[PDB]
Design a binder for this molecule. Structure first.
Ligand SMILES: CC(C)=CCC/C(C)=C\CC/C(C)=C\CC/C(C)=C\CC/C(C)=C\CC/C(C)=C\CC/C(C)=C/CC/C(C)=C\COP(=O)(O)OP(=O)(O)O
Length: 371
């Protein structure tokens, strides 16, 4: 994967190039490896030495730049998406006078040594091409045991206040912000929280989801409470409900009017996962798996190796047998007085994790994996 570091100044700065600078403001406490490589590239190509004025973060560097407390900053493209949270117009306030491309090695999927594996499902709250960066509002772990034919779905509330791995600097923030750093941040965050290996991920957005539901002929669920979604457009009665793609999207997005709010939304997402699984494991869908891949590969990202898809599909085609699915959700207390690492100037709602819910969730995951 690709990212870049740049030297940025204010849009109307008289500074045109890096040789005109003596210093740059940069978060060398937290992004030093990348920053030094940029500085080394600058020295190599333009024979210019810059001293660093340390900032506490990219956000803080940006604030110094716009306050005129520094003439130039280093920006890391990954963290521009964080800055955008507090400063939506940031891109319009700056120009870049030096740019350096970087690539990070992609952490391979992990093959399980046994009959169990974990797939992390990340749902991105945006329409459009799958490469659009946004927060991860769906965060569901699928723990699958091929031997016992059991699936456990563990949902972690998108507001869950957890140490965010990688770009999150292991500081506590709401889980959903991990999706802005990238799927690897999301993955490592949840591995650390639950003490498990995540073998694979699937990342999709609103547009990806609609495309998938259409392809499968919609989905069928049992709805437990009467509710409506999307400013009253869809009405869902108690009982068996068929959901076409727009209906299904409404079904998984509504929370405010639900008896258990965001918890019930998470349960609705789990119902839809089961319903999707039931369509994906029909004989027709399994036979036609390549067509499904062909039709959805542009809008759904996954690191499940093709080899692995073929094995899972053909094993299921040969064996049959449905998976028994159970669901759980990490519980906690909503608070508005805890600091957000990504948004330190905003009061955000977060969910402080309940220690005993966490223990129960972890033990349930281990139980399914062991058998
Ligand atoms: C694999 C095959 C084909 C076969 C073998 C399968 C087999 C027999 C066995 C193995 C099982 C395996 C390996 C796989 C099963 C298939 C898998 C892994 C997945 C299928 C399910 C899936 C990919 C997705 C379902 C995810 C879902 C419920 C929703 C995603 C859509 C989005 C982005 C919703 C956002 C809604 C929210 C909360 C906020 C936005 O709302 P907003 O931002 O407006 O408001 P807010 O709230 O913020 O205020």
């Amino acid at each position: 994967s690709e990212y870049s570091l740049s030297v940025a100044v204010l849009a109307d700065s008289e500074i045109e190039n890096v040789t005109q600078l003596t210093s740059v403001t940069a978060p060398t406490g937290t992004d030093n490896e990348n920053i030094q490589k940029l500085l080394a590239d600058i020295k190599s190509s333009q024979n210019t030495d810059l001293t660093v004025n340390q900032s506490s973060s990219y956000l803080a560097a940006y604030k110094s730049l716009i306050a005129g407390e520094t003439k130039a900053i280093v920006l890391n493209s990954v963290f521009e998406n964080i800055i955008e949270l507090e400063y939506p117009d940031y891109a319009s306030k700056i120009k870049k006078i030096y740019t350096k491309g970087f690539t990070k090695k992609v952490e391979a999927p992990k093959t399980s040594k046994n009959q169990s594996f974990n797939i992390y499902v990340s749902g991105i709250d945006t329409y459009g091409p799958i490469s659009s960066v946004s927060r991860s509002d769906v965060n569901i772990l699928m723990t699958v045991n091929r031997d016992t034919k059991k699936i456990l779905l563990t949902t972690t509330p998108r507001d869950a206040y957890v140490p965010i791995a990688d770009g999150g600097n292991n500081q506590k923030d709401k889980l959903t912000h991990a999706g802005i750093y990238g799927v690897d941040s999301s993955i490592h965050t949840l591995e650390n929280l639950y003490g498990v290996d995540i073998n694979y991920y699937v990342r999709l957005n609103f547009t990806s989801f609609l495309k998938m539901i259409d392809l499968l002929g919609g989905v069928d669920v049992h709805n437990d409470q009467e509710f409506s979604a999307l400013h009253g457009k869809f009405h869902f009665p108690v009982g068996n409900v068929h959901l076409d793609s727009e209906q299904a999207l409404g079904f998984v997005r509504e929370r405010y009017s639900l008896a258990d709010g965001d918890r019930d939304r998470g349960r609705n997402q789990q119902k839809v996962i089961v319903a999707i699984l039931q369509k994906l494991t029909s004989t027709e869908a399994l036979k036609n798996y390549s067509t499904i891949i062909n039709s959805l590969q542009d809008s759904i990202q996954t690191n499940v190796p093709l080899e692995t898809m073929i094995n899972l599909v053909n094993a299921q085609l040969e064996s049959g047998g449905n998976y028994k699915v159970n669901s759980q959700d990490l519980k906690g207390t909503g608070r508005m007085d805890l600091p957000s690492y990504a948004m330190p100037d905003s009061n955000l709602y977060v969910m402080e994790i309940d220690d005993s819910s966490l223990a129960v969730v972890k033990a349930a995951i281990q139980d399914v994996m062991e058998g």
